[PDB]
Design an enzyme around this catalytic site. Structure first.
Site, PDB file in Angstrom:
ATOM      1  CG  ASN A  43      -0.278  -0.461   2.416  1.00 45.19           C
ATOM      2  OD1 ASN A  43       0.920  -0.678   2.418  1.00 45.19           O
ATOM      3  ND2 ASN A  43      -1.040  -0.627   3.477  1.00 45.19           N
ATOM      4  CD  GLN A  44       4.311  -0.686   0.961  1.00 46.28           C
ATOM      5  OE1 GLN A  44       3.155  -0.954   0.608  1.00 46.28           O
ATOM      6  NE2 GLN A  44       5.223  -1.613   1.181  1.00 46.28           N
ATOM      7  CD  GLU A  45       5.498   6.166  -1.741  1.00 44.31           C
ATOM      8  OE1 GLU A  45       5.478   5.035  -1.211  1.00 44.31           O
ATOM      9  OE2 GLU A  45       6.290   7.057  -1.379  1.00 44.31           O
ATOM     10  CG  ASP A  46      -0.961   7.643  -2.294  1.00 43.64           C
ATOM     11  OD1 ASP A  46      -0.708   7.670  -1.074  1.00 43.64           O
ATOM     12  OD2 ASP A  46      -0.698   8.579  -3.070  1.00 43.64           O
ATOM     13  CB  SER A  47      -0.786   0.671  -3.638  1.00 46.15           C
ATOM     14  OG  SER A  47      -1.447  -0.341  -4.339  1.00 46.15           O
TER      15      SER A  47
END
Ligand SMILES: [Zn+2]
Ligand SMILES: [Zn+2]
Ligand SMILES: [Zn+2]
Ligand SMILES: [Zn+2]
Lengths: 56, 147, 53, 66, 56, 56, 53, 49, 49, 279, 44
Positions: free
Chosen positions: B1-5
């Protein structure tokens, strides 16, 4: 440069035309050709040419 | 989910979270270039047309349309068109028979694959044969979708 | 058809589950975010009384 | 649209409960939070669905097709 | 500026991206569809004759 | 592309579930969060170009 | 189908009705089955009828 | 006093229809003194939109 | 096993956007070819480059 | 010479070769053999998706007006200097007649099909001693009627004469010579809906009118010297079969028709009531 | 049975010009008769 550039060559007298690979008929792909811009302009040129020479 | 995933539950997808329909239409009609006899909505067979595609025209019917409710893959044609020209020496010259096709059929968009739903035909403003179809697709969420 | 719950949630019987161990946090597998008191600011487990404080 | 079958989070069947939850609010004059409680949905992942689902199906249905 | 200095090309692909902490830096994950569309020629040697035969 | 990065080379591991896939550390040279961005691929076609691509 | 409700809704919402499965072990998978196309000894058949009465 | 008012009808009907279909705000003379985005197509992705 | 740090949790309202990946995936190797400039054509739908 | 190329697989040769087009690859392959034939095909549909010379003829049309990146006085200079070759071609007369029939057809609110058919009809003859002038009204009206009729839009001669009076005689001779010209180079039932449109009646009297017109056409009684009149009194007896006040005294000036002819048709159908009603 | 046209279930069975404005209705838009052919689905 006399072998490449002359001021009397710098006036248009006899004009080359480019072959249809430069100015292709787009072949309008519904039923027609819709044939294109440069050739329209060349047809104009030759029309005005013959008009001038007959008038002369 | 890093950078808005996002991580998203597969099971909720399976149950039916965020499912969606998708409706696409197409528009085609006969065109008159006459000497007033126009194009036709027929079913092009092999020895009628020129350079027609490999869309495997079997899904059409005798009136040149597809039936609602059947499924369509990516390359299936849905509309059949034929050139009414004349003057082309339409079945006597510069082509064999291969009667008068110069086929102008409309294939489906090359990727999606739905089900044909609610096809209607009615004349246009001036009176022609004028066709609208509609196809329907289910779009389950996948990896790349954006919320 | 047969099917199992691994490849679709159709074939589940499960529908929910619950799970808990060491309700009093004697094993220290967590420590409580707080601002005055862990004890005051968190509700007691329902399963507290089946083990001694 | 209908109520969903089977809550996305949990999985418990929902959809039997819909018209029941309606008539708990028609004649019984009952508060809805207690209505879901007496309907018996004690987790809240299940509870959100009945509380927030809208019923567009009848608004569709008031056309006259065929 | 649109046909000489830059242009359309071939052998290319375009999707969206997502993170992965199971690929080291010099690696990139490609969908099987893209790798089925794209290609790359190889010349047949004594070394790769069997593998290319199998792959054909 | 603005600076020397954002054309960098990679090895390819084919993955399922169509989208690209790359390591999180290389994210800031590309200057690309996963908010819906999109990349581009360019397959080399010969040995010279493969070699110089891998070595530079 | 005639209803306002869409066909793949009908499919998907059918797919989620739980079914009686006490005797599930008696039959076997369609994949492992000696038959083809849903014999009685691997599958079961359901039928629905509706009317705007 | 009758035959020309019908082509008159064609002119004003054609003009209004053309202006609203195109968005250029001027008659069928290649859009002098005109504005472009005047008659966009209705956005219908969502009731709020 | 228990996680160490307790986490935030709750319901929240989302909505699904139209930019879906199935309309943005695109690739081409040796496809159709333009006429005036003899280049790969444009168009993701038109199988361009 | 003929310069012509037919594709042929140089390793199969079994027919005019059964080949296919791989349009997404721009290549043609001998489908029986599998070897590519030629590569880098040229587009055939996106060129149409990107966006009448035959009616306007070989000479190329030019709609020339004014632009934006020049002064208004220079646009006026352009309009004054653009009119220096309006006499060399006969195309000036061709688009003059085209403009005239454009005015006439769109004044008669006709379809674009009818407009193009009239354009074709004028373009086909367009210059003959058989034409011989006739004030342009005869030939324009004849071409418009021929094109509109062959587009299966039948219009009445009274309406054509009300739009353009061509004294009903030179119009007829011109129609005959256009008939002969098109014959060398090579629908009464359709009139009724326009009249019931002008009277405002539902579908069932129209269907009754069609049935009665075909039946009275089948048997006897041409009865009237252009029996559009008895076609009209078919509607008259239909509306007498119903009970809506559409009196013949109104109908005569509603359709610019004689009331005595209406009563004569009423009589000749009064003795012939027998087989004209369907239900 | 080939066309629908309306709220009426007028099975026009059309060949050509059999009052496309159907007799019980007054519509003239001619909707087109969902097939009898058997269709497949997949309730995954
Ligand atoms: Zn739940
Ligand atoms: Zn079996
Ligand atoms: Zn071959
Ligand atoms: Zn109807």
């Amino acid at each position: 440069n006399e072998v490449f550039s002359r001021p009397e060559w710098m006036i248009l007298t006899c004009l080359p035309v480019p072959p249809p690979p430069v100015r292709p008929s787009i072949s309008f792909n519904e039923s027609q050709r819709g044939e294109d811009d440069l050739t329209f302009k060349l047809a104009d040129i030759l029309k005005a040419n013959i008009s001038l020479e007959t008038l002369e | 989910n890093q950078e808005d995933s996002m991580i998203m539950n597969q099971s909720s997808i399976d149950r039916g979270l965020f499912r969606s329909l998708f409706f696409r239409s197409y528009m085609d009609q006969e065109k008159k270039y006459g000497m007033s006899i126009t194009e036709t909505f027929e079913k092009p067979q092999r020895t009628n047309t020129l350079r027609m595609k490999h869309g495997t025209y079997d899904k059409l019917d005798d009136d040149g349309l597809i039936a609602p409710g059947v499924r369509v893959s990516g390359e299936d044609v849905i509309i059949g068109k034929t050139t009414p020209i004349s003057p082309d020496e339409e079945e006597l010259g510069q082509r064999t028979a291969y009667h008068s096709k110069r086929d102008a059929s409309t294939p489906l968009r090359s990727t999606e694959n739905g089900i044909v739903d609610q096809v209607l035909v009615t004349t246009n403003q001036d009176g022609l044969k004028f066709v609208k179809v509609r196809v329907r697709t289910t779009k389950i969420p996948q990896i790349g979708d954006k919320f | 058809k047969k099917g199992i719950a691994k490849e679709h949630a159709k074939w589940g019987p499960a529908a929910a589950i619950e799970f808990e161990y060491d309700p009093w946090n004697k094993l220290k597998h967590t420590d409580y975010w707080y601002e005055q008191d862990s004890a005051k600011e968190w509700p007691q487990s329902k399963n507290c009384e089946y083990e001694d404080p | 649209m209908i109520v969903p079958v089977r809550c996305f989070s949990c999985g418990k069947v929902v959809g039997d409960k819909w018209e029941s939850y309606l008539n708990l609010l028609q004649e019984d004059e009952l508060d809805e939070g207690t209505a879901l409680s007496r309907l018996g949905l004690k987790r809240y992942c299940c509870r959100r669905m009945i509380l927030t689902h809208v019923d567009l199906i009848e608004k569709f249905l008031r056309y006259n097709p065929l | 500026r649109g046909n000489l200095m830059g242009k359309r090309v071939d052998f290319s692909a375009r999707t969206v991206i997502s993170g992965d902490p199971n690929l080291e830096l010099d690696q990139v994950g490609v969908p099987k569809s893209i790798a089925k569309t794209l290609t790359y020629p190889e010349v047949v040697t004594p070394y790769n004759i069997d593998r290319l035969t199998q792959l054909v | 592309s603005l600076h020397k990065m954002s054309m960098m080379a990679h090895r390819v591991k084919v993955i399922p579930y169509s989208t690209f896939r790359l390591n999180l550390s290389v994210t800031s040279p590309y200057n690309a969060d996963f908010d819906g961005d999109e990349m581009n691929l360019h397959v080399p076609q010969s040995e010279e170009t493969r070699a110089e691509l891998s070595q530079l | 189908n005639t209803t306002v409700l869409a066909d793949e809704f009908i499919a998907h919402r059918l797919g989620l009705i739980p079914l009686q499965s006490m005797d599930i072990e008696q039959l076997e998978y369609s994949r492992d089955c000696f038959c083809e196309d849903h014999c009685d000894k691997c599958s079961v058949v359901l039928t629905l009828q509706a009317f705007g009465e | 006093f009758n035959m020309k008012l019908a082509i008159n009808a064609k002119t004003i009907t054609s003009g209004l229809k053309y202006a609203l279909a195109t968005g250029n705000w001027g008659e069928q003379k290649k859009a002098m003194s005109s504005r472009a985005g005047v008659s966009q197509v209705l956005n219908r992705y969502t009731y709020s939109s | 096993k228990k996680l160490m740090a307790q986490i935030f949790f709750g319901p929240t309202y989302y909505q699904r956007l139209r930019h879906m990946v199935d309309d943005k995936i695109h690739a081409r190797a040796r496809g159709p070819m333009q006429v005036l400039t003899r280049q790969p054509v444009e168009g993701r739908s038109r199988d361009g480059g | 010479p003929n310069l012509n190329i037919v594709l042929t697989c140089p390793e199969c040769k079994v027919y005019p070769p059964k080949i296919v087009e791989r349009f997404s690859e721009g290549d043609v392959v001998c489908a029986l053999c599998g070897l590519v034939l030629s590569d880098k095909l040229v587009d055939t549909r996106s060129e149409w998706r990107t966006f009448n010379p035959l009616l306007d003829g070989n000479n190329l049309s030019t709609r020339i007006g004014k632009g934006e990146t020049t002064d208004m006085r220079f646009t006026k200079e352009l309009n004054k200097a653009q009119g220096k070759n309006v006499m060399d071609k006969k195309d000036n007369e061709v688009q003059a007649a085209f403009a005239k029939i454009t005015m006439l057809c769109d004044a008669a609110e006709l379809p674009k099909i009818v407009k193009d058919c009239a354009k074709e009809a004028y373009k086909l003859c367009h210059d003959e001693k058989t034409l011989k002038g006739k004030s342009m009204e005869s030939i324009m009206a004849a071409s418009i009627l021929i094109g509109c009729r062959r587009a299966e839009v039948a219009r009445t001669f009274k309406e054509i004469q009300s739009l353009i009076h061509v004294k009903t005689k030179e119009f007829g001779k011109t129609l005959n010579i256009m008939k002969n010209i098109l014959r060398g180079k090579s629908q009464n039932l359709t009139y009724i809906p326009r009249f019931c449109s002008h009277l405002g009646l539902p579908m069932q009297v129209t269907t009754s009118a069609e049935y009665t017109a075909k039946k009275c056409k089948e048997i006897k009684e041409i009865a009237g010297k252009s029996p559009i009149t008895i076609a009209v009194v078919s509607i008259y007896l239909n509306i007498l079969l119903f009970q809506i006040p559409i009196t013949a005294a109104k109908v005569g000036q509603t359709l610019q028709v004689t009331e005595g002819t209406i009563k004569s048709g009423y009589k000749i159908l009064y003795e012939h009531r027998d087989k004209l009603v369907d239900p | 049975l080939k066309y629908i046209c309306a709220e009426c279930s007028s099975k026009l069975s059309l060949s050509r010009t059999d009052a496309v404005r159907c007799k019980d209705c007054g519509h003239r838009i001619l909707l087109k008769a969902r097939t009898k052919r058997l269709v497949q689905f997949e309730a995954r």
